[model samples]
Target: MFENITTAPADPILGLADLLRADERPGKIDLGMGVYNDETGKTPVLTSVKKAEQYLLENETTKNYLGIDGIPEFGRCTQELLFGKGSALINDKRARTAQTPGGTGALRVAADFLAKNTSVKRVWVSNPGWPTHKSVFNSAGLEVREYAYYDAENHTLDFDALINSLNEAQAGDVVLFHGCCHNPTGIDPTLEQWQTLAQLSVEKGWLPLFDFAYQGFARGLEEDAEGLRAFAAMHKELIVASSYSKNFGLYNERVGACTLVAADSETVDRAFSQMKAAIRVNYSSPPAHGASVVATILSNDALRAIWEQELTDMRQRIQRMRQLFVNTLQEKGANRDFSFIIKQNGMFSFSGLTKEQVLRLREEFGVYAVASGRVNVAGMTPDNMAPLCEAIVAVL
Candidate 1:
């Protein structure tokens, strides 16, 4: 057992992060890793978070474990963000939530719950979606299948192909939907399209699991959740994984939630029991600090307002970068049409650069992007815009 261990491959995102860290070039641009960066090229902590932490530091008395589901306020706050404060999903007690380490933690716990409690053996993910989606489900012994999503050639959502491919999924299968601001490809379904997908799920009877990592990144919090709300309106049962990393700027703090919705209160309780069991065998319980900060910010009206404004600022900044990226590329005399990036939502854009071009970007230009052509739009700033565009043009 000690003699034959083979080295696993480095994680694509984390590996790129390590490379970016080691580079000595002062002008190096990093468009890899899905974290948000400000105009100063830093993932600064939220003002709301700092205020909340100050309160917690002064007020909190204990440093105890938060059980398997963390604090009740944390769960309630997460539910309100996801399903609205007084929505039927919460008013009727149809949803139950548990705090986890992060969105990845929530996903893992959900995967374990599904593997343990349901007969669902397969999980369907979008083609060209975050690679971690496949790895997380596969690690939980679930078979991963791909559904057509983005059209790389044209840089748009292939709605017809998406619906047709998902139609192949049988009842009892689990389908993962990016609630909004889809990772890697920033392309999300329109509200009407979400209705169509929801109808498909209802007719096909496949379980829907929404990975909602970027709740406030696409549009406003309520607006971004419209698609997920559409599914909740039709589907009697659903699963959601929520992350506070990007939205709350609590990346290292690692607080998120896994929520389960069922037809009735009793059903929700029954489902949540298995969720806790899954958590028990894994990490036992979640950390308290991040969840406490989230609860604090969401619960207080003043702090919540501050958080909302800050989130809006981040969303607007990413949108500006998207426009600037396309305009700068055009201004730099790049012949290819790169305007599609302006329409993509969230912090990422499928730049349509090939693997060779991406590698060239990293090697010659010290500009790093995912091999699949996913560039973090938030990574772009006015200062680095010129050189980054020139590098991209050169690679093209």
Candidate 2:
């Protein structure tokens, strides 16, 4: 049986990682993977995370297994961070959160929860979304459909088309949304657009699922929560997958949460039971260290402040790079208007480079980006920005 099994195809993102590693070019600039990099070209551990780990190392009393839903403190802190302090969802006990291995784990658990517990048979995702979105939902035996999103030629969100496309989804279907700092495209709906979409969801009676990986990498924590908050205000039920991989610099530690909100506390409890069952079968229980570090930092006031400041610094650095990238492209004599990149939030942007151009960039210029033209703006630094722009211009 094992002899006849064929090899699976390589993952698009991870495949790029392999290619980038193999390239021997001295000036190679990797704009591939979505992870955040500091000015020194490293995904450094955050200072706040180090302190939290120190506290955990000195005081942690257990190597015992956590519950299927993870620790109570982690769940509480995750809910507060996502919904904001004093949120009605928390006050009314309408929400339940489960710690997961990572955002991907949360997504898989949420997908399995919908597959096993609900009548949700279809999930709507954005066209040109993170490649993992469709694969995850489809693997859970749900039909995945693409809704219109990025307008490549115009380099902006095609909101009207998005609304029209999503109109096809009716009740009992799940529509996945990026909470903030949309992956790949780096385009997000405005507050008003979010409100409109939320109202539309209420009218359509469809459930909203948010993948919130880059919470602080966008504008601000509160500002980034605007869209999900809008949905929470209008919808009685929704799901959120929050990740600390990017924000806390805990990529290897795999920290994340899956939260569900329902119409009432009792309904939420019922849903949360199913969520725990899903976790029990999938991974038995989440690891303790990452969640412990997150809980320590979020629950403590001083540590929380330091984390917030560090997050602010990261956000500002990415914003600065966006401006510098566009400015450098203009300075490099690229006639295309990349100024739209400045308005886009988060670490990624669709560079509008064709597949051939992307390949040409890799072979001819030692610059690497996704074949779909999605470039990680966070990967750019003051040192690499000029070479990256020059390569981009040469390809164009």
Candidate 3:
């Protein structure tokens, strides 16, 4: 085993982070890793989480295992948040949820579950999307297809192209979407676009899976979840994998849930049971600490209120940074118009910089960003504006 196990290639995001850390430049900026940083460039543990942890420290009774599906309290609260508390489907027992390590774990588990259960042979992910997506699905032995999503030249969604390709997709094929603020490319489709997808999903019978990593990051919770709601309402079956890592600032704790909306209560029951097997096989049971933290915050009205405000602050801060970034580009005499940054949503900006330009930013300016030009909008600060803008201008 040792002889054949060669050194594996480094993760692109982590590799960039490592390179950024290795550089000893005083003016270095890390735009790598999908993390939300404050104006002071600190990934502060959210105040709400801090409160939750304190409460847990006093209240937590035992470190007993939560079994394979983790705890139902966390899943129930998360499901309520994702699918709405008074949802008819949720009330009808059509919506079933299970706790996972994180959204990625949910995605992988869902992929494995779907591949094992359904007739699905392939999952169509957006082109110019999460690099980890292809690997996750592929490793799970599912064929992965890249569907048209973003137009690099125009810096806009190629909706017509995406719709056309999706129309031709097989009835049982899986079409995964970034439910709220799309990763890498923060440009999510309009409400009308979502409706079109929902209708298409209903008509064509193509399985729709929403990777809802950023629920409140796009506009607001309600606004961001509009797309997911539309699909859940119309479609007979749907999959939602959501994360608390970004919204709750539980990045390392990895709190998340995988929700499966089926046709009936029977399907939900069966899927829930099957989900346990998947969970039991892979990692046995998710950690209890993160689940407890989420449960504590969600169940308590005061802590929940505090968490909501914190989320709102984070969302608005990212929006301001996006606007400021665009303003800075214009203010600093960028070679190209950069109004698209404002148009984009979520923590990322598909900055439209080429691979070469990104490397130049790394080598010359000590600024690190993805080669595909995706930068964390939340990583920018008022203080770093001059350096970031100057670096970008130099590359341009």
Candidate 4:
């Protein structure tokens, strides 16, 4: 009976990675996965992370398991990082946080917690969100739905459509948002637009959940968290899943946290217990190394400043890549107007390439991009940028 099990479909992104690895062509490029790389196509550990690790190695005395809620220091500083030190939510003692395995782990924890604790039946995600958003929530046994977001035809945010669609969210529904640097599409709502959505969330009584995978990757740390902060300031309740994978370059370390903001200090304690129960049933506890490293870096003042400057460098390089990629496409005299890629934010730019075109780029030019035309800007380096741009021009 077990022998009759069916084969699962290949993961679109990871499958491409396997193909890219197997290909012997010297000209081949890997743009399918979401990992960040330098001009050398290697994901380097941040100096800040390196310092954190060194410090931990010197002082860390035990390899014991962390609590089901992970370290309180991790949660405390992580919340401050997300909502800021002066946020009224923090000041009012309304925020409760739990460290998880990674961004996905945090998301899964929140999904399971909400399923058990709240009357929420569905979660509304962006139409072209990270594929994991839909799958993870679905795995947690909630109906996953998409609201209008990216406009493929024009490669822009369909704000009016997004508003019209999500406005219908029921009181018990969860509306998921990309905290910054929206995953496949780089477009983000203006701060004013976020405020409007905040008012709508209040009116609809919908609980908001933010998946903040790229905190410092989009804008600076504080600037990137604007949406989450705005929502927390106006709305009393929130759920946020944050990742250190992108910013700290701690991909394998699997560091991240999920936070819940209740109405008051008492409610914070009550909601936190429910969240703790979710963790207890799940992993029982998160890993200790990553959180320990992150907490060490964040709590130290000099380390924090170094981390900020390093983050600024990485953020600026991506911004420069956007301009370089677009300029290269235009210099090649490509027929298409590829300027929209410049306007896109975060790590990705919607390439506006069709399914057939993407296939052509992969097969004919050895350039791997998602079928959805989502290309990782972080994957482009000075050495590879010209070739990638030329491949697109040829495909077009």
Give model 2's TM-score versus the native structure. Answer: 0.98
Q: In angstroms, how far off is 322's CA in candidate 1?
A: 1.3
Per-residue lDDT tens digits for candidate 3, residues 239-348, read 88888899989999988888888899998888878877887889889988888898999899999899999999998999998888888888998898998888888899
Where does candidate 2 stray beyond 4 Å?
none
TM-scores, all candidates, are 0.98, 0.98, 0.97, 0.97
lDDT score at residue 180, model 2, on the 0-100 scale? 87
Q: Which parts of model 1 have CA positions greater than 4 angstroms off?
A: none
Candidate 3: worst-modelled 10 consecutive residues by lDDT: 12-21
Candidate 4 on 281-370: residue-level lDDT in tens?
888999988888889989999998988888788888888888998888889877878888888878888887899999999988999999
In model 3, the clashing pairs are none
Which consecutive 10 residues in model 2 have the weakest lDDT in total? 16-25
lDDT accuracy of residue 144 in candidate 3: 92
Backbone clash count for every predicted candidate, in the order shown: 0, 0, 0, 0
In the predicted model 1, the residue pairs found to clash are none
Superposed Cα deviation of residue 127, candidate 2 (Å): 0.9
Candidate number of the best TM-score? 1
Error of 2 at 283 (Å): 0.8
lDDT of 2 at 138: 90
- TM-score of predicted structure 4: 0.97
The true-versus-predicted C-alpha distance at residue 113 of model 3, in Å, is 1.1
Per-candidate Cα lDDT values, in order, are 0.92, 0.90, 0.87, 0.87
